[PDB]
Design a protein around this ligand. Structure first.
Ligand SMILES: [N-]=[N+]=Nc1ccc(C(=O)NCCC(F)(F)F)cc1
Ligand SMILES: [N-]=[N+]=Nc1ccc(C(=O)NCCC(F)(F)F)cc1
Lengths: 186, 186
C-alpha cells in the first residue's frame, strides 16, 4: 500500500504537476481513505521526496555497479547511468528539480548525491592522470563539478523538451564528446 | 520614478526573495503610494520581468559589441560578458531563474536570449571550422546548446554559492578550458 501511493503519484505526475495533485487524488489512486494515506506519509511533498530518493539511489547503485567491474566508452557507460535512470523516470525528475526551490529536504538530497558523483568523477580523472592517460590541466574537482552540472542541466532540458535543448536522441553523444575532450585535451 | 521602483526592487532582492516583498515595500522604497506604483507596473512580478529584461539586454548588447570588433582569449572574452554582467546583478539573476518555474513571460524571455546566444556560439564554431581552425566533430548547434547550458547552470550555482559549485574566482577559467578543448579537440 506504500508502493501503491508511490506508483499512483508517479502516474499522476506524468499528466500534471504536484500543485495540481491532492492527497485525496493519491488516496483514491492507491484505493485507501485520505486518513489512511497519512499513516504512510505526512504530505504529498514527502511522497515526491521518497520517489526522488529511490530514483537517485537507483542511479547511485548503478554507478557503483560500474565502479566495481576504451576511455570514450568508460565515460559513455557512466553518463548512460544518468541518461537511462532519469530518462525512465522523467515526471519524478521534472517534479524533483522543481521542488528544489520549495523543499529543503529535496535540495539537500540532490546536493548530497551531486557532491558524491562529482567526488567520483574527480577520483576517476585523478586516476587517469596518475597513470599518464590524462594531462594535469584544471583542478580535477573543479572540472568534475562543471561537467556534472552540465549533465544535470542538459539531460533535464532534453527530458522536458525545453527550448533550447539537445534532442534526446543526440544528448548522450553530445555530453560524451565534451567530457572526453575536456578530460584528455590540452 | 520608474527607475526608483526598479532600484528599490533590486535592493530588496539582495536581502530576501520576491515572495517576501510586498507592493507596499516597493512603493515606500520609491517614495510613492501603493496606487501610484500600479500606474507604472501591474505587479511585483512585472518589476522582476523588467529588471531581468534589462540585465539580459545589457549582456546581449555587450556580446554584440565584441562581435563587431588568440582563440582561447576570444572565448574567454565572450564567456566574460555573462560572468561580469550577471555577476554584477546576482539578486536579479537568482530571482529571474526562480521565476522561470512560475512566470511564462520570464521563461519565454530567458528561452529567447538563450536561443540567440546558442545561434551565435554555433556561427562562431562553424566560422572556426570553415577556416580550418576547428575540426568537424559534433553538429555545431548541439555542441553550442550544451556549452551554453553548462554556463547557465555553472555561473548561477557559483553566484548563489550552491553546494556543489565552482568557486567564483575559479569558474571563468573552468568554463574556458571546457569550451576551448571541446570546440578544438578530437
Ligand atoms: N565513470 N564516470 N563517472 C561519472 C560519469 C558521469 C556522471 C554524470 O553524468 N553526472 C551527472 C549527474 C546528474 F546531474 F545527475 F545527471 C558522474 C560520474
Ligand atoms: N565569442 N563567443 N560567443 C559566446 C560565448 C559565451 C556564451 C555563453 O557563455 N553563454 C552562456 C549564456 C548564459 F547562460 F546566460 F550564461 C555565449 C556565446
Amino acid at each position: 500500500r506504500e508502493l501503491a501511493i508511490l506508483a499512483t503519484a508517479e502516474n499522476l505526475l506524468e499528466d500534471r504537476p504536484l500543485a495540481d495533485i491532492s492527497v485525496d487524488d493519491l488516496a483514491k489512486g492507491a484505493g485507501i481513505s485520505r486518513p489512511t494515506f497519512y499513516f504512510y506519509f505526512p504530505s504529498k511533498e514527502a511522497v515526491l521526496l521518497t520517489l526522488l530518493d529511490r530514483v537517485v539511489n537507483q542511479a547511485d547503485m548503478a554507478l557503483q555497479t560500474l565502479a566495481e567491474n576504451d576511455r570514450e566508452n568508460m565515460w559513455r557507460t557512466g553518463i548512460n547511468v544518468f541518461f537511462e535512470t532519469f530518462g525512465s523516470h522523467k515526471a519524478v525528475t521534472r517534479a524533483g528539480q522543481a521542488a528544489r526551490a520549495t523543499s529543503v529536504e529535496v535540495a539537500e538530497l540532490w546536493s548530497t548525491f551531486m557532491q558524491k558523483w562529482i567526488a567520483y568523477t574527480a577520483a576517476v580523472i585523478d586516476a587517469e592522470r596518475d597513470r599518464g592517460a590524462a594531462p594535469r590541466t584544471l583542478p580535477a574537482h573543479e572540472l568534475a563539478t562543471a561537467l556534472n552540472l552540465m549533465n544535470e542541466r542538459t539531460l533535464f532540458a532534453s527530458f522536458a523538451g525545453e527550448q533550447p535543448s539537445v534532442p534526446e536522441a543526440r544528448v548522450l553523444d553530445t555530453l560524451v564528446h565534451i567530457w572526453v575532450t575536456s578530460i584528455y585535451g590540452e
